[PDB]
Amino acid sequence: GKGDRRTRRGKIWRGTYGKYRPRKK
Amino acid sequence: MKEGIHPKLVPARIICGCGNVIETYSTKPEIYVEVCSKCHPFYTGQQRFVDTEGRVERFQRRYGDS
Amino acid sequence: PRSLKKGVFVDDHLLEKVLELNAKGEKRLIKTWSRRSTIVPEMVGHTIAVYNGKQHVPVYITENMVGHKLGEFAPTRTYRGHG
Amino acid sequence: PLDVALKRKYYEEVRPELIRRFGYQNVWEVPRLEKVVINQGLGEAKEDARILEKAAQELALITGQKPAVTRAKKSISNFKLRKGMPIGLRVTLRRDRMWIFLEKLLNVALPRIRDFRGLNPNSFDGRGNYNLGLREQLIFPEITYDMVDALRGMDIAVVTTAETDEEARALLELLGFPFRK
Amino acid sequence: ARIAGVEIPRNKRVDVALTYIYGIGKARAKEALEKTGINPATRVKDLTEAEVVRLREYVENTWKLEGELRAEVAANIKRLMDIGCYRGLRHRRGLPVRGQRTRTNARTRKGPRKTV
RNA sequence: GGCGACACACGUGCUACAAUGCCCACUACAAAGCGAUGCCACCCGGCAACGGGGAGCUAAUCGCAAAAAGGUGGGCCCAGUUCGGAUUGGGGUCUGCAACCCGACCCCAUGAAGCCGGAAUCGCUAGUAAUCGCGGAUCAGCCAUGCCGCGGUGAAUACG
RNA sequence: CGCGGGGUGGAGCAGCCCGGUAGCUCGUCGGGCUCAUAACCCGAAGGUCGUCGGUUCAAAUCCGGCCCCCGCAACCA
RNA sequence: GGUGGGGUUCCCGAGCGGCCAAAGGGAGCAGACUGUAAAUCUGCCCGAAGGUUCGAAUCCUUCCCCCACCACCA
RNA sequence: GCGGUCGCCUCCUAAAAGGUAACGGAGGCGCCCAAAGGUCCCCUCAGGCGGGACGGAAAUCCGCCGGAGAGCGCAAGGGUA
Ligand SMILES: [Mg+2]
Ligand SMILES: [Mg+2]
Ligand SMILES: [Mg+2]
Ligand SMILES: [Mg+2]
Ligand SMILES: [Mg+2]
Ligand SMILES: [Mg+2]
Ligand SMILES: [Mg+2]
Ligand SMILES: [Mg+2]
Ligand SMILES: [Mg+2]
Ligand SMILES: [Mg+2]
Ligand SMILES: [Mg+2]
Ligand SMILES: [Mg+2]
Ligand SMILES: [Mg+2]
Ligand SMILES: [Mg+2]
Ligand SMILES: [Mg+2]
Ligand SMILES: [Mg+2]
Ligand SMILES: [Mg+2]
Ligand SMILES: [Mg+2]
Ligand SMILES: [Mg+2]
Ligand SMILES: [Mg+2]
Ligand SMILES: [Mg+2]
Ligand SMILES: [Mg+2]
Ligand SMILES: [Mg+2]
Ligand SMILES: [Mg+2]
Ligand SMILES: [Mg+2]
C-alpha cells in the first residue's frame, strides 16, 4: 500500500527511488 | 511394572544434525530430532556463532579514523 | 541510525580544552554550550557541564556513551507528569 | 534393556573420577543416582478430566511409565480448588528407566530448549538433590507437535545419595548436565 | 520443519514461510533460498529433507535469530536507558523515541487513551 | 533553549482494514509547469539512498521524465494473511558551520492498531462525485499527507 | 438500661432469608445536538458493604462484641 | 392423607391421532420510519420411563414436581 | 407486670470420689452418613526450612526436621497415630 516504502507503489507515493523502485529504462 | 496399559519402550534409533544416537531405548523407535547438542552443535563445545561484542566496539572503530 | 561518516563533526571549542586536559596532570569541570558535538574517547572520565538552555548540567562521562552527542545527556524539558 | 549408555558411563567414567576427587573410603559412600521423580501441576485442568488424561498419555510416552494422579490435599478457594479434585500427574521412575530417561534428557531434550544457556546451579537443595522446571513438553523426542492441544510443562526432581551439595553437583556434572557455571 | 528457536512453518511457500521466523523475511528469505539453491515457489509441506538441513544450518548460522536477536534488541535498549540518555528515558516513559509529537495521537507507543 | 512539550479533548487530513485486492515482470497513452549560481541525460562504483566521472540546453532544441491507474503474464488463496505499515533495534546516504532536543531519505531486522466504525455528521447534479498519477510556488534540506494547479480513467441519481 | 429494625458507590435505595460474581434511579466524567444552556442521545468511571473479632474452603451475606441510627416501652408507685 | 387440574422452543399460551420445529403473543436479533421515546411494518428462531397401533406433543399404565380443593390431627 | 427463660449436650462455678444453687460465666442440639457402616489389608499428621515452569501466604512434586499441636461430619470436653 502507498505507505509501505518496501513496495513499488509505496515508493511512488513518496516519489522516492531505491531497491524496490529502481530508476531504469 | 503392571501388565497392560504401559508403553513398550523398545531399543530405538535417533538422528540429528549429527550422526545417530545409538543408545535410545524409548517407545516410538526411530525418532527424528531438531538439533541435538552434545555432538557439539548448540553452545556445547561452544561455537558462539554470529557473535558480536560490538556494542561499545563499533563506534570505537569505524569512528576511530573516518 | 542517521549520519556523517566523513568528517565526524565535533566543535573545537571544547576539544581544545579536553585535549589540553588529557596531558596536563589535571581534570576538572568544563562548562560548555556545545550540545551539537559528539562525545569521547579522549573525553571519557571527564566531567562536563552542559547547557540545556537554562543551565549547565554536570555529566560524568563513561565509555558506553561513545558515539552520542553531548546534548543527549542534557535534556531540555521538565515534565514530572500531569496530575 | 540393561545396557543404557549413561548407566555404563556412570560406572566406567563417573564413579572413578568421583573417588579420585572426594577420596571416598567405601564402595557405597560414593554418590549413586536414585529416583528421578517427574511431576506436572495441572490445575489448569480442574473440572475437565479430559484435559488431564491426554497429559498422562503424554508422560507415559516420554517416561515409559503411566503416571499417578495427585489430588487436592485441602480446599483452597481463591483459585477454585475444592478438596480431592485432580490437580496433576506424578510419576516416579528409577533403575534403568530413570537412566534411559536421563540419557534422552541430556542429549535431546535440553538442546531443544529455546535459548538454554545451561542449567542454573543453585537448585541443589543443600542436602544434595537437584530440581528443575520445564516450560513445554515437545522438547522431548517422543512428542510430534501435531499431538499437542496445549503446552504444559513439569517439575523434575533428581535424588542423590550424596550427603552434600558440592558432591551432588560433581556427580551430575560428570554425568554431563550442562550447568550455567 | 524446525528452525532457530523452534518456529515450525508449514504449507504456504518456503520463501514466505521463512518470514514467519523472528529475524527473517522478504530480503533475508529470498537470499537464503538461492544460496542453498532451493526453489522459493516450492511448498515446505513437501521437499527433500536435504533442502531442510541445507536451509536450517545456513539460516541458523549466518545471522542471529529469534532467541538471540530478541535479547540483543532488548539489550541495547537497556543500555540506552541506565546510561541516562534522552533516547533512553523515552524508553523509560514508554513514550515515542524518535521525534514525532505527543500532543496528539502517540497511541501505538502510548497505549489506549485514559480520558479525564 | 522553546515555539516539536503530553493525563487528555476537538477540527481538518493521510494510510488502511483487502481478492473489482496485494506483490513481481514486461508493455503502453497525458497536460501543465520547471531549470545553465540550475535541470541533469549517458557511463562507472553502490543491493540502494547516493557518490564519482561527464555530454546537451540561456532551452517547442537539451533536462527534470518514470506518468500512475490501465494492458499482458505469472504468483498469493480468505489467513490479522504476500492484507495494513504504526512502533522499535541496527546499518548507512545527503543538505548544512551544525541534524541531542527536532530533519528528509536508503537498506536489514521489527512488525502494532486496525476485519469497515455509537449518538451523530460532510461533500457532490457530469467529464461532476469516485479513483490515479504529474507539476510548480516557498525552499540549503524538510517534517508537504498541506496548498495552488495539470491532465488520466470515469459512475449513480433527482418522484417531488 | 429494656425490646424490634437498621448502617452498602457522591444522594436515595435493592441485595443479606438462602455463603460463591454487589444491582437501581439520580448524580459525576467523555462525546453528540444547539449560536448557547437545559431537556434529550451515545459512551464511561466510581463502592469493600459502620467497625473489631469468630465460623467456614469462601462472609455485604451466618455468629459475637463495640459504635452510631430509627421506632416502641418505662405501668401499679 | 384425599380429590381435581397441570407440566410444551427463553417467558406466557393454546395443544390436534394422520406430520404439525408444533397457533399465537411478547421477549431477542436484523432491516424500514425516526427531534427524543414508542407505536406501526417486514424477515429470523413437547416433565419422565414404558407401552398401543403404520403414524404419539394427542390414548393408557407408571413416576416426579406444580397449582387447586376438601378433610384430619393422639 | 414488662423483658428474659422453660427439654437436651459440653465447660467452668463444684471446695482433687459422687452430687450440689442463683434472672452466676461461656457455648451448642431438635440433625447427619448406603458410606461417614462391618471386616481384612496397607498408609501416618499439622507445621517449619531448602528445592521446583505456569504456582502467588498457601494446587501439585523432592529433600530433610517435626510425638502429635493435624484428623476424627457439627459445640465443647475427654480420648486418640
Ligand atoms: Mg504490504
Ligand atoms: Mg541427597
Ligand atoms: Mg516532539
Ligand atoms: Mg506551531
Ligand atoms: Mg494530513
Ligand atoms: Mg526550436
Ligand atoms: Mg486485533
Ligand atoms: Mg531534534
Ligand atoms: Mg480478512
Ligand atoms: Mg470513519
Ligand atoms: Mg448545482
Ligand atoms: Mg487507493
Ligand atoms: Mg505532490
Ligand atoms: Mg454531559
Ligand atoms: Mg447540553
Ligand atoms: Mg473471613
Ligand atoms: Mg393498671
Ligand atoms: Mg435517533
Ligand atoms: Mg413475658
Ligand atoms: Mg466433684
Ligand atoms: Mg469435694
Ligand atoms: Mg440456645
Ligand atoms: Mg510439609
Ligand atoms: Mg517450599
Ligand atoms: Mg487434637
β-bridge partners, B21: B14
| Nine cell digits for residue D73 | 490435599
Three-class secondary structure of residue E66 per DSSP:
helix
Instruction: Give chain E's radius of gyration (CA, Å).
Output: 19
Give the span between the Cα atoms of E65 and E28, in whole angstroms. 11
Q: Which nucleotide is nearest to E115 (CA to C1')?
A: F8
Q: How far is the CA of B3 from the C1' of I11 (A)?
A: 58
B3 touches chain E (CB under 8 A): no
The residue written with cell numbers 552527542 in the block is C69
Instruction: Give chain B's radius of gyration (CA, Å).
Output: 22
Give the span between the Cα atoms of D139 and D131, in whole angstroms. 18
Q: Which nucleotide is nearest to E17 (CA to C1')?
A: F82
Q: CA C57, C63, C64, C65 torsion: positive or negative?
A: positive
Q: Taking a C-beta distance cutoff of 8 angstroms, is the pair C76, C53 a contact? A: yes
CB–CB contact C66 B66 (8 Å): no
Q: Which nucleotide is nearest to D127 (CA to C1')?
A: I63
Q: Taking a C-beta distance cutoff of 8 angstroms, is the pair C50, C70 a contact? A: yes
Q: For strand G, which nucleotides have at least one atom less than 7 Å from a protein CB?
A: 20, 29-30, 57-58
Taken in order of first residue, the domains within chain E and their CATH numbers are 1-71 (1.10.8.50), 72-116 (4.10.910.10)
Contacts of D110 (CB under 8 A, 6+ apart): B37, D116, D119, D139, D178
- Answer for B43: CB within 7 Å of strand F: no
Burial of E1 (0-12, 13-18, 19+ CB in 10 A): middle
Give the span between the Cα atoms of E58 and C60, in whole angstroms. 44
Q: Where are the alpha helices (DSSP H) in chain A?
A: 8-14
CB–CB contact E85 C73 (8 Å): yes
**What's the gap in Å between E115 CA and the centre of ligand 15?**
20
B57 annotated to bind ligand: no
Give the span between the Cα atoms of A12 and A22, in whole angstroms. 11
What one-character DSSP code corresponds to residue E18? T
Contacts of E112 (CB under 8 A, 6+ apart): none
The residue written with cell numbers 514525532 in the block is E100
Give the sheet arrangement for strand D86-93, strand by strand.
D68-71, D86-93, D33-41, D154-160, D130-134
Q: Within 10 Å of residue D25's Cβ, how many Cβ atoms?
A: 8
Q: Distance, in angstroms, between E67 CA and closest chain D CA?
A: 6
Q: How many CA atoms lie within 13 A of C33 on its CB side?
A: 2
CB–CB contact D114 E8 (8 Å): no
Q: Does domain C8-83 have CATH number 3.30.860.10?
A: yes
Give the span between the Cα atoms of E96 and D9, in whole angstroms. 57
**Per-residue buried b or exposed e for C14-29, using 16+ beta carbons within 10 Å of the residue's own CB:** beebbeebeeeeeeee
Give the span between the Cα atoms of E68 and B50, in whole angstroms. 10
Show me where the domains of chain C are located.
8-83
What one-character DSSP code corresponds to residue C63? G
Chain C residues with CB-CB distance to E89 below 8 A: 75
B32 annotated to bind ligand: no
Q: Which of D104, D179, D177 is closest to B36 using CA atoms?
A: D104
Q: How many CA atoms lie within 13 A of E51 on its CB side?
A: 17
Which amino acid type is present at position D91? V
Q: How far is the CA of A5 from the C1' of F63 (A)?
A: 27
The residue written with cell numbers 497511541 in the block is E107
- Answer for C74: CB within 7 Å of strand F: yes
**What's the gap in Å between E107 CA and the centre of ligand 15?**
30
Provide the strand spans (E) within C1-83: 30-32, 47-51, 56-60
What one-character DSSP code corresponds to residue B56? T
What one-character DSSP code corresponds to residue B31? B
Q: Taking a C-beta distance cutoff of 8 angstroms, is the pair D64, B9 a contact? A: yes
Q: Taking a C-beta distance cutoff of 8 angstroms, is the pair D86, D52 a contact? A: yes
Give the span between the Cα atoms of D108 and B17, in whole angstroms. 12
